[PDB]
């Protein structure tokens with residue numbers, strides 16, 4: 271894009287970025303404009319007499335390059351950019367900061383046969399990298415990496431305990447536990463931002479499946495009470511009180 | 517060239533993982549030990565001079581995760597609701613998935629009621645009659661399957677692929 275031929279492509283992206291300020295911030299409107307812009311610039315990469323040209327993979331990389339450049343510029347305007355998203359982030363952070371202190375694998379129906387003794391530490395850490403990145407793709411990759419790590423660790427546990435291959439019954443509870451333990455900041459806003467701004471053609475397949483798992487994890491976690499983690503009413507509230515004290 | 521999202525629904529131990537592993541990998545735990553997980557699979561099938569690419573989504577079957585399931589079955593073209601023929605509570609639960617799928621999604625979904633571990637005789641607790649009758653009255657079909665012996669595993673997916681609107 272620093273090439274003298276790319277001149278007007280650069281002017282086209284820059285004028286999108288500045289003409290994005292002109293309208294009052296609105297998530298559902300904004301993300302429509304961004305995807306339309308992505309679709310159009312995508313089309314303009316492949317159709318360009320100069321670019322005909324690149325392999326499919328290379329064209330896909332330019333799409334991600336475009337996504338990263340544009341979203342980095344638009345980040346503060348579009349990320350956690352209203353009161354209800356800020357409130358929801360804080361509620362989720364608050365709930366997890368307490369629950370992580372007393373939650374155990376049996377609370378979520380994780381069987382001792384699928385125990386990991388690091389408590390899937392590496393997966394926790396992959397998830398926490400989420401606020402190291404601004405591009406939706408790089409945020410999503412942290413999520414996908416977390417999921418791939420969990421899956422490989424579940425596979426090892428079934429090898430060691432001569433069990434059947436793990437499914438969603440194994441994976442989801444472990445993703446929930448791992449998310450509670452990692453408590454990544456602005457998890458609500460991060461998921462919404464990926465869902466809204468990831469190149470739409472790419473939030474598909476296995477990526478979409480694991481993304482749906484983490485959205486469902488968020489939802490479960492938001493709604494944790496005594497019954498949903500199999501603790502007595504009085505035991506749960508007592509656990510929450512000690513958690514607030516530390 | 518025909519993409520279809522297929523959800524697997526059923527409670528833990530019913531045989532969700534076993535069914536799809538048989539279908540996808542031609543493997544069963546007793547004969548071939550583990551290699552990959554089974555929560556997600558893409559699988560292609562040939563039907564009457566065509567092709568169906570199944571995207572297969574597994575769901576967590578425990579009760580505490582029940583209210584999350586609509587997120588998984590949203591927009592599915594199809595669902596296999598699995599129960600274990602040796603476990604009556606699994607069948608009660610399979611029936612609830614069917615009513616929910618009828619209430620809360622999605623009119624042209626192809627639902628298949630799978631009655632699994634059919635190879636198991638002494639322990640059988642759910643009659644083919646109850647399962648068949650139930651399916652017949654609720655617009656879906658019942659198939660007895662066995663992941664262990666491979667009986668009706670390939671067939672149940674073909675039979676879903678056959679019915680795709």
Ligand SMILES: Nc1nc2c(ncn2[C@@H]2O[C@H](COP(=O)(O)OP(=O)(O)O)[C@@H](O)[C@H]2O)c(=O)[nH]1
Nearest residue numbers: 434437528529530531532533534633662663664
């Ligand atoms: N005999 C027999 N056993 C089965 C069959 N399908 C699954 N199983 C076993 O029943 C247990 C639960 O099955 P699984 O696939 O893990 O169920 P899931 O929790 O629903 O995924 C496992 O130990 C399987 O080996 C079958 O068709 N016949």
